[PDB]
Design a protein around this motif. Structure first.
Motif, PDB file in Angstrom:
ATOM      1  N   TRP A 101       0.767  -1.234   0.000  1.00 26.82           N
ATOM      2  CA  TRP A 101       0.000   0.000   0.000  1.00 26.82           C
ATOM      3  C   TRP A 101       0.804   1.294   0.000  1.00 26.82           C
ATOM      4  O   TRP A 101       1.860   1.391   0.618  1.00 26.82           O
ATOM      5  CB  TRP A 101      -0.882   0.060   1.242  1.00 26.82           C
ATOM      6  N   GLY A 136      -0.421   5.460   0.414  1.00 26.09           N
ATOM      7  CA  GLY A 136      -1.438   6.492   0.522  1.00 26.09           C
ATOM      8  C   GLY A 136      -0.841   7.868   0.289  1.00 26.09           C
ATOM      9  O   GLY A 136       0.328   8.100   0.598  1.00 26.09           O
ATOM     10  N   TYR A 180       8.111   4.891   0.300  1.00 28.75           N
ATOM     11  CA  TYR A 180       7.507   4.137   1.398  1.00 28.75           C
ATOM     12  C   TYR A 180       6.204   3.423   1.090  1.00 28.75           C
ATOM     13  O   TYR A 180       5.359   3.963   0.391  1.00 28.75           O
ATOM     14  CB  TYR A 180       7.290   5.044   2.607  1.00 28.75           C
ATOM     15  N   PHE A 181       6.051   2.231   1.677  1.00 26.55           N
ATOM     16  CA  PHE A 181       4.879   1.376   1.515  1.00 26.55           C
ATOM     17  C   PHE A 181       4.549   0.719   2.846  1.00 26.55           C
ATOM     18  O   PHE A 181       5.383   0.692   3.745  1.00 26.55           O
ATOM     19  CB  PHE A 181       5.150   0.266   0.505  1.00 26.55           C
ATOM     20  N   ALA A 182       3.352   0.137   2.936  1.00 27.26           N
ATOM     21  CA  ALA A 182       2.885  -0.517   4.148  1.00 27.26           C
ATOM     22  C   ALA A 182       2.164  -1.796   3.783  1.00 27.26           C
ATOM     23  O   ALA A 182       1.827  -1.996   2.618  1.00 27.26           O
ATOM     24  CB  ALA A 182       1.924   0.398   4.882  1.00 27.26           C
ATOM     25  N   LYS A 229      -2.211   1.917   8.011  1.00 28.31           N
ATOM     26  CA  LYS A 229      -1.102   2.860   8.059  1.00 28.31           C
ATOM     27  C   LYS A 229      -1.044   3.806   6.861  1.00 28.31           C
ATOM     28  O   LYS A 229      -0.757   4.987   7.006  1.00 28.31           O
ATOM     29  CB  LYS A 229       0.248   2.154   8.228  1.00 28.31           C
ATOM     30  N   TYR A 248      -2.252   8.622   5.453  1.00 30.62           N
ATOM     31  CA  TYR A 248      -1.535   9.594   4.632  1.00 30.62           C
ATOM     32  C   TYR A 248      -2.405  10.183   3.537  1.00 30.62           C
ATOM     33  O   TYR A 248      -1.948  11.016   2.759  1.00 30.62           O
ATOM     34  CB  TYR A 248      -0.274   8.978   4.045  1.00 30.62           C
TER      35      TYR A 248
HETATM   36  C1  DHQ Z   1       6.118   6.785   6.045  1.00 29.79           C
HETATM   37  C2  DHQ Z   1       5.157   5.815   5.326  1.00 29.79           C
HETATM   38  C3  DHQ Z   1       5.151   4.462   5.684  1.00 29.79           C
HETATM   39  C4  DHQ Z   1       4.297   3.547   5.047  1.00 29.79           C
HETATM   40  C5  DHQ Z   1       3.418   3.975   4.059  1.00 29.79           C
HETATM   41  C6  DHQ Z   1       3.408   5.328   3.686  1.00 29.79           C
HETATM   42  C7  DHQ Z   1       4.279   6.254   4.310  1.00 29.79           C
HETATM   43  C8  DHQ Z   1       4.207   7.718   3.848  1.00 29.79           C
HETATM   44  C9  DHQ Z   1       3.932   7.761   2.320  1.00 29.79           C
HETATM   45  N1  DHQ Z   1       2.743   6.994   1.979  1.00 29.79           N
HETATM   46  C10 DHQ Z   1       2.468   5.828   2.628  1.00 29.79           C
HETATM   47  O1  DHQ Z   1       1.474   5.143   2.369  1.00 29.79           O
END
Ligand code: DHQ
Length: 350
Positions: A200, A202, A235-237, A242, A246
């Motif tokens: 993911w 955002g 960055y991803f999650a 999480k 954003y």
């Molecule tokens: C810092 C961070 C960690 C995990 C996902 C994201 C972020 C910020 C940028 N967008 C995200 O989805």
């Protein structure tokens, strides 16, 4: 008229909405009277990053207060701010400086959006929506709500909504299959890597015209490495929760956009604390911030050879970690291939 499906029309109108661009800017406290949407230039933003980099250095190293004052004045003159009836704060606090580095990351995408919007729109043989869609150079298609592809993605959304983020619910309004021009080709070399996952990402709706046309990108050379927890990567999650945060939605503005990208992680360099990474250890392809909660590794599935961590949020064994959830960072723009864009509806508990 527009030949596009209705959802895609509503999506284009939304990512190109001028009013949202101004709201974003007012939220960052920019002075819209001294700094209209049309004044923003890439060069201007580059210079601002540099000023932030220098002031960041002076605070850390105990530079003269005169230096910090001069840098703050130059920054506020380059990017006019409106603090209302209060005095303007100096860039002498590392957290305020971090906030400002983030504002610039956003202004970089807003600038791209406005530029495209005022671009070649003279053609009368095309509907305005159709013209702007073409400006994205991204093939967008509606994913069938009742197909397996959509079922898996909805499972990923539902199962990975973290406990501490349950201040709202999430409804998937629409799922779009996207393919940015030439992205599959620059990503080809990475299909040779193992540990490829569907993660993911955002961002504010105001950033989407920039993300679709330019793709996700690392902050420029001028930005301070300090402005970001694990350095200047992407960055991803693995928890929809999480990333959703954003999107910066609210009760007053509940629709958010979120991306699902295939990311070539390979051998991850696991960290439990911040590290303003510059060089990556030999044999490592990405960074993984370890969290206290992650999807149940038992339920992990595959979707076209890519791992989808759709399991329910389970507690990992790690305790000596500062993070609540995992974070994945890649330092090469070619290590990601965007796949889906979801239209989410944030239902806030009231
Ligand atoms: C810092 C961070 C960690 C995990 C996902 C994201 C972020 C910020 C940028 N967008 C995200 O989805």
């Amino acid at each position: 008229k527009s030949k596009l499906a209705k959802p895609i029309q509503d999506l284009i109108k939304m990512i190109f909405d001028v009013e949202s661009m101004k709201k974003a800017m007012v939220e960052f406290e920019i002075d819209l009277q001294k700094m209209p949407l049309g004044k923003l230039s890439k060069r201007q933003i580059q210079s601002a990053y540099s000023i932030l980099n220098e002031v960041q250095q002076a605070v850390s190293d105990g530079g003269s207060e005169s230096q910090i004052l001069d840098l703050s004045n130059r920054f506020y003159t380059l990017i006019p701010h409106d603090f209302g009836m209060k005095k303007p704060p100096l860039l002498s606090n590392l957290e305020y400086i971090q906030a400002k580095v983030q504002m610039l990351d956003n202004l970089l995408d807003i600038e791209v959006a406005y530029s495209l919007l005022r671009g070649g729109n003279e053609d009368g043989d095309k509907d305005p929506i159709d013209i702007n869609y073409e400006k994205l150079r991204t093939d967008i298609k509606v994913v069938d709500k009742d197909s397996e592809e959509a079922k898996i993605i909805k499972q990923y959304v539902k199962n990975t909504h973290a406990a501490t983020h349950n201040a709202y619910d999430l409804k998937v309004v629409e799922i779009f299959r996207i393919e940015r021009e030439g992205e599959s080709q620059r990503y080809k070399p990475f299909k040779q890597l193992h540990n490829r996952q569907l993660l993911w990402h955002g961002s504010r709706t105001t950033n989407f015209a920039g993300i679709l046309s330019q793709g996700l990108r690392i902050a420029p050379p001028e930005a301070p490495v300090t402005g970001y927890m694990f350095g200047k990567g992407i960055y991803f999650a693995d928890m929809v929760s999480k990333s959703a945060n954003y999107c910066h939605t609210s009760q007053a503005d509940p629709i958010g956009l979120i991306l699902l990208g295939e990311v070539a992680l390979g051998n991850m360099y696991e960290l439990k604390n911040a590290s303003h990474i510059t060089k990556l250890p030999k044999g490592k392809h990405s960074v993984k911030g370890l969290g206290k909660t992650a999807p149940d590794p038992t339920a992990t599935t595959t979707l076209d050879g890519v791992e989808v961590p759709l399991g329910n949020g389970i507690s990992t064994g790690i305790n000596d970690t500062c993070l609540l959830y995992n974070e994945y960072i890649v330092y090469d723009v070619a290590q990601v291939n965007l796949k889906y864009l979801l239209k989410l509806k944030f239902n806030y508990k009231t």
